[model samples]
Each structure stands twice: as structure tokens, then as C-alpha cells.
Target: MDPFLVLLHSVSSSLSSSELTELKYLCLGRVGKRKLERVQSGLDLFSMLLEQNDLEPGHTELLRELLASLRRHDLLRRVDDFE
Candidate 1:
């Protein structure tokens, strides 16, 4: 699998259901509401972001920003290491 996808999978696995929901909420405008509703995990959310060109491999600024907004500094650290 792509390293970015692998990284997302690792991060997503650490998220709670509520955190996933909040992350998806943060993605509201970028991804269609209906599509966001169908997203069941952080990995799925990231996939949608990739599909929409809202996210890209080697460019994780948006992901970091979102995690920061969620106050998930712990997760942000993980993303930081990836970059």
C-alpha cells in the first residue's frame, strides 16, 4: 500500500469513534455532506480528502491543522514524524 495510506491507517486506528466524527465534521465544506456521512473511520475520511485533492502525499499540512484544531497534539506528533 502507499505509505501515505499506511500512515493514515495507523493514525486512524488510534482514533475513537467520536474523534472520527469530529474530524469528519471539520471536513464538512471540503467533502460533500452526504459523502462525509458515509465515512466511518479516519482512514476513510482521509481517502475522501485524497479523492477531493484536499490532501496529497508528501503534503500533510491540512492533516496537521485538523489534528491541531481537535487538540490532538499526540496524533499531531505522529504526523510530524511522518513529514
Candidate 2:
């Protein structure tokens, strides 16, 4: 990972838990007004990160499980197609 991207990601994670919750909901549903396509876009940006690398199967499985739970609770929403 480049130092610049690491710095940016650090800045991005400065969100409080509440703020993070808001972002997650927005990412999955809720207020789609922010157009935050880059929350995880950073992850996709640099493919060479190492420390605590979460692109692995376990990490993805964890997220997938969370999404599955959201789906079961009818709280999962992919707003990428929204106008």
C-alpha cells in the first residue's frame, strides 16, 4: 500500500461508530444522498496492501455473513442502481 492511500484510509476511518453506522446504512440503504461510492472504493483502489489485509476469504465471509443477516432482517439495500 502506498503511504498516501494509507493516510487517506486513516482519515476515512476517523468516523465515529455512530457515523460509521450511518455510512454502513447509507452504503446498504438509508440516506443515499452522500454518494459515498469510495468508502470501500479505497480498498479497490490499491491491490497491494498487506497489514491486516481483509480481502481474504475470512474477512469477506464475515462481511457476507453480516449482509446475509441484513437480508434476513430486510435491512439490506444495494442502492448502486438508484437514481
Candidate 3:
């Protein structure tokens, strides 16, 4: 699996359901309203992002902010770890 997906999966698992919901809301608010309905987890969201033609500036920033806001430094550490 892709490392970002793996990191997000691991981080997502550690989050409470409410945190996941807030993360999803942050995503929808920035990315789009209707695209994430079928996304069951953070892993799913990563897949959707990668499938896009390009990562929007808002999406990238939101990902960083969400990771930072969620206090997932371990996950954020992997930001520069992506190949």
C-alpha cells in the first residue's frame, strides 16, 4: 500500500469516532461537499485524493492542518517521507 495511505490508516485508527467525523468535515469543507460520502475511513479518503488529477492547494494544506490539529506528529513526520 502507499505510505501515506498506511500512515493515515494507522493514524485514523487511533482517532475517536468524533475526531474522524471532524476530520471528514474539514475535508468536505475544503475539498468538496459530496465526494466523501462513500469514504468509510481515512484510508479511503487517501485513495480518493490520489485518484484525482492533481492535488488542489486547499486539499494539501487541509491535510497538513488536519494532521497537525489532530496532534498526529508521528503521521506528520511521514509527510516528507512520501516518495
Candidate 4:
């Protein structure tokens, strides 16, 4: 299985709808507003990041930064464990 997908699922599952919206907002400019409007969950946002080459399987720096910006220290810990 893809490790990145696994990590994405674990992280996404913990996000609230508002948190997902914050994540989408963080991607503004990188991911178009129209595309972000269609994203309903963390999975959708992360998948879009992946497709745009902003995220990858062993690369969690940007994810870490985003989580930190959202003050999601809990999810940051999970990403740490995954790393």
C-alpha cells in the first residue's frame, strides 16, 4: 500500500470540517478557489496537494508547516509518528 495514502487517511480522519476549511484556505493560490470549494474533507485537500506535487510519500515538511499554522499540534504529533 502507499504509505502516503495511509498517512493521509490517518491525518484527515482527525480533522473537523472547519479544520478542513482552514487547510483549504492555506492552499489558496497553490490550489484554485474553485477546486478548494469542492473539497469537503482533509483527504480531498491532501489528495489535491499530492496531485499538485506539493506533497509526497516521505515528504512531510509542507504538511507539518500547514498543521503548525493551524495550531494542530495533535495532528503534528501524528505526522511525527509517521515520519
Candidate 5:
């Protein structure tokens, strides 16, 4: 159905169980008790997509180029540190 909800499922399935679980925890902490479960799901899925698709160096260079352009376009405000 909704593209937003679909992403959650996609991401959740893509990432490792631990990473998916961690993102669930992060979202809960950021959003508070129970107001935004779907968004958390989306975050977890987004993480999964990145881990599966972009974490690899070969393709990640392409993503790096994209991020570079995003920076150049001023679309990116700052570096995102998952660490």
C-alpha cells in the first residue's frame, strides 16, 4: 500500500536481526514510548537497505559520489555518523 509503510518491511527484512533490533531501540528512544512505531519500522528498514545495498565498497563509492553531490547541492546538512 503506502510507499512509507512498504519501506519498513523492505528495510526490516534487509538488515541483520541485531541491526534491525538496534534501530528499533533507537527509534523508541528518540520518539518516546509508543507514539511512532511505524517510523521506527521505517528507520529499521532504511538501515537494512543501506546495509545490504550501500555497505559494500564497490557500490558504496557510487553512493559516496551521490552524497558528494548532495553536499554540493546543499541538500545534506551534515555528515551522518551511524557510529
Candidate 6:
């Protein structure tokens, strides 16, 4: 595997189960009235991310945008890179 993939796996594994659950909710669902998409694509991608321990850059950016938009930047901070 590549270093990038290793990094992703490390980051994914570093997060606690509770944190991952919250991250998933923040990604797939909305925040306050700042809710996530109703469609399946984003959620589907998120599901894959959890299972595969990987994220495409575009998807990562999209999730970052969602976190910022929802004013829940704290969740992003869960990632060591973000911190």
C-alpha cells in the first residue's frame, strides 16, 4: 500500500469508535438546521470511507466543507492532521 493509504488507515484507526460514529453523523446528517444531504451519494461515500479506511481528496474536501458549514469544526479536529 502507498504512504497515503497508510496514513489514512492510521488516522482512521486512531479515532475512537464514538468519534467515528459522531463523524459519520456529522458527515451524513445535518447540524442543527445545518443538516446533511438527504440523498444517498454522500452517505454512501461516507459508509465506504468507514469500511475501507480511505477517503478521496474530493470527498475529504466535501466533508471539510460540511464540518465548517455546520460550525462543528471540533469533529474535524479529531483527525491528528487537523489538530
Best-fitting candidate, measured by lDDT? Answer: 1
Please provide the root mean square deviation of candidate 5 (C-alpha atoms, Å). Answer: 12.5
Quantify all predictions' global Cα lDDT against the true fold.
Answer: 0.76, 0.35, 0.61, 0.75, 0.38, 0.45
Per-residue CA lDDT of candidate 5, range 1-83, in tens? 33433433444445445443544555455434453344443444344434554433223333234345434322112212220
- Once fitted onto the true fold, the runs of candidate 1 whose alpha carbons sit more than 4 angstroms away are none
Cα lDDT tens digits for candidate 2, 1-83: 34544443453344345434543663454323333344453333223322343323222333334446444322222211110
User: What is residue 29's positional error in candidate 3, in angstroms?
Assistant: 3.0
RMSD each, Å: 1.7, 12.5, 4.1, 1.8, 12.5, 7.9
Q: Give the TM-score of candidate 2.
A: 0.28
- Residue 25's lDDT within candidate 6 is 74
CA shift of 9, model 5, Å: 1.3
On TM-score, the leading prediction is: 1
Query: Tens-digit lDDT track for model 1 on 1-83?
Result: 56777888898878879778777787788556877777776787778766665566667787678788898777888777776
Model 2: weakest 10-residue lDDT segment is: 74-83
Candidates 2 and 6 compared: the better one by TM-score is: 6
Residue 25 in model 3: lDDT: 76
Q: After superposition, how far is residue 55 of candidate 1 from its true place, in Å?
A: 2.0
Candidate 6: tens digits of C-alpha lDDT, residues 1-83: 33433444455554455444555576543432233233232343344553443445323555455446546544465432432
Task: Give the candidates in order of lDDT, highest first.
Answer: 1, 4, 3, 6, 5, 2
Candidate 1: Cα lDDT at 37:
75
TM-score of each: 0.81, 0.28, 0.61, 0.79, 0.32, 0.39
In model 6, the worst 10-residue window by lDDT is 32-41
